[PDB]
Nucleic acid binder design. Sequence first.
RNA 1: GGGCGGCUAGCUCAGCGGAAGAGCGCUCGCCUCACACGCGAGAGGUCGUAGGUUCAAGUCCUACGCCGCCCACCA
Length: 862
Amino acid sequence: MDLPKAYDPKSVEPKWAEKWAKNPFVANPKSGKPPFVIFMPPPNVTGSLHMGHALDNSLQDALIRYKRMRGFEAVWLPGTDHAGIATQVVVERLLLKEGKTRHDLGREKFLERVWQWKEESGGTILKQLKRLGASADWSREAFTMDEKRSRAVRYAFSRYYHEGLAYRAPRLVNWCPRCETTLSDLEVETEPTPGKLYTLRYEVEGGGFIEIATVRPETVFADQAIAVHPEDERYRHLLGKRARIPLTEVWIPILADPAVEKDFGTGALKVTPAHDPLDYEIGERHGLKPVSVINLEGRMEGERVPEALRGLDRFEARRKAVELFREAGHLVKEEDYTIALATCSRCGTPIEYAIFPQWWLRMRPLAEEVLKGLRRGDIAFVPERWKKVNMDWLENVKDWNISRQLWWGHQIPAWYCEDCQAVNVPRPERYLEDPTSCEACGSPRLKRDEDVFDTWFSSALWPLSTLGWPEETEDLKAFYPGDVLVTGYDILFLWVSRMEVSGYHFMGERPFKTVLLHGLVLDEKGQKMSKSKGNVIDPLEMVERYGADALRFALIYLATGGQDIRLDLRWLEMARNFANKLYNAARFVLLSREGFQAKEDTPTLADRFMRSRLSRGVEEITALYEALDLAQAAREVYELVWSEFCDWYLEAAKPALKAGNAHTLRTLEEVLAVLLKLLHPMMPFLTSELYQALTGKEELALEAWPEPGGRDEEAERAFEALKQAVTAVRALKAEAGLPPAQEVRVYLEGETAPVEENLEVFRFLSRADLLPERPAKALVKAMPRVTARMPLEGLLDVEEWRRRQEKRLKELLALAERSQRKLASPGFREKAPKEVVEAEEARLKENLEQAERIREALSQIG
RNA sequence: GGGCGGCUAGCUCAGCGGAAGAGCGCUCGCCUCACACGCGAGAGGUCGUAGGUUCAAGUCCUACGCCGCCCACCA
Ligand SMILES: CC(C)[C@H](N)C(=O)NS(=O)(=O)NC[C@H]1O[C@@H](n2cnc3c(N)ncnc32)[C@H](O)[C@@H]1O
């Protein structure tokens, strides 16, 4: 230890960070010690980490460390996620911001550049976590696209397919013509945008009219019906007729359908299954054959599409499309409108739609496999309000498109016969085998799906792929049901649920026993922190400015009840300042036991007090950790250390130390140990440095959690008496306008036994000598247990003392009033505890007694 | 259209059935021999509104008001 005046994290953290980095806390399946498991949610290989991740891992670490030194086999599986779609976009940008882009350089040369990036980003992420003191079993670091994990998916898919659950068809898919790939619902964002709602109208067979309101005019040529609510009899004479479509000679039918909202536009809508999910739905509800007018490049093409209108852009197609309507006479009324325009969550461009042969996953069945558990009580949720939010999600699931036309992810394991057009999917038993002949036509010619999987598809395979489940390892046997899943609600759907499936379906058991959902950190502005918003702060920018133990402490302190966390640097100071206080407290004890000269070993009230107040602390804090309420523990230990140890105990001990008392110097050292223990999970660095200098131990992390010792009833009540006498006096001086160090005489009445037995402490703390005889005239301070009288010697600020006391009375009678009203209240007398009632009575007893002392003094004073 | 979270001291946030709290800021004193990233003494809240339950309500029930999320096929 190098005990300077102020604590410099930079002289401590880095050396320990490295010591822990180079020598991980490796897990042992045969440790024959109760395990505790946590799967770290793998950070996306896109850039660095931000304060969010920090909150996330900081919480995890604190649990790992606690559990570890609590007696378990702390297993925290680290790892990074390839991000798929994400990383893709990221590397593309780096490229273009150079000159060339994706297509510009093959599917190889590019797939290369992405890995180089996977290294930078994946590497940086690891440092960051190491520097934040992550005691993660880096021996088992995993990576979504490493051999051991790529096997987890490939097998997972195989079992799915050959099980039926994973199929291939042409359901409708949300497609982004930017990235050229299908997305999933959860992957697209519908952000309200100003547009135009056009009402077109056209010829009915025999009769003459039908009117429709569509945001996209171009999608008319691909119509297959006009839908009208079932009960909207305003169309009763149009129901079942026809409709030449504008510019066409195509005659669409007029059908009913519950999905038509009569009150929107005209009571009827156009139906275009090949270009929209609502129409596709209604479409395939009256069996309407799909038909497209625009291709994946987002351009015009099709049978219906009219000459000269086929070709150019999807939008530059509706402009000229409208003019050909009104000027042709079918465009009735156009008008502004705020449309719920769907865009690609990761590139912005508005998604299109298309029927494509893709890989889907019968979610309906799986989802229930999970609900079975939740329903039973298998999984626990911390905020707990998320149980429902989860279940209700699974309640209404929709077959998930697993395919992706991206160049990143896992090349799916499916082979297509260039002859009988059949799919060849390796079986479980030989999942690793690449078919060489079609099991349909027996042909040798085969072609493998060039698609890729959804990053979210592999990620749902984590509580398994980190334990080598592609196979059947010992890790997976020793610790599969994870103990607590830490993550922020932002991915409770695309991860937590997805994983609950893999777990209940591939293992028939909860992937984890408790799901811990913490809020999200967000810029001061109140909005979420994320690479996308461009509102991110590197955790290392903060660590270098306040220190890792600080950053860790802020973040935990603030993570209360799964609530979000608004960025407020003030909280980072809060933390730093506290580290420093903890530090100083330690410096004092270290510098104290310096050249100490033992001269007695006498138990001191102050000692017996802090020991007791400590058990109280250990008990409380443990239970808090036991309830996964770290944020609370954080402020409960702040309390202990600062307000009970530094503010009162250390001070109360200085005289005894000058007096060369060993029992005290001892107690200080012992109490400081336990405290360093308690604080460790949150502030690991400083807490270790200190503990080593204090006891020689080089790995506090491995020490055992403290157990509450005794608890001294009287002692605690005795020392409170003291605290009061001391504060009374220093409150008097304050009011009198007397300087702090000013020598002073005082007289005490009441529970004074404590002050008498521990004179020197009283003196040292109040800076006052005790008067044997009560002074006639004097300034008075009335405290609950004790009362203080200060002689009128010197120049005192009576106006102040007056005001202050004229104000305590204004309050003591007020308190007496409330109590009276209670005690004499209907029902309160007996309908309340035989305790809260007799005590609320002992409040009245003394609120008066004090009000009296003050009243008398207050008036007595000339 | 549904759900949810928030609304407590100037600011940022805890508390969530029995006498209103923290950090910072502010006022007054202090370089008191661990700490000025500090010490001591104070000021500052009818706990978003309207009801209701209960001996007892920021703390529970009920509508509502704003701020923000998530989910949904109003073309
Ligand atoms: C499979 C998933 C783990 C995926 N690779 C992924 O979620 N990758 S990530 O970079 O977004 N990291 C997400 C994890 O970090 C948390 N997180 C991300 N942003 C924040 C934030 N602003 N506040 C609090 N927590 C946040 C998520 O809870 C998740 O654990």
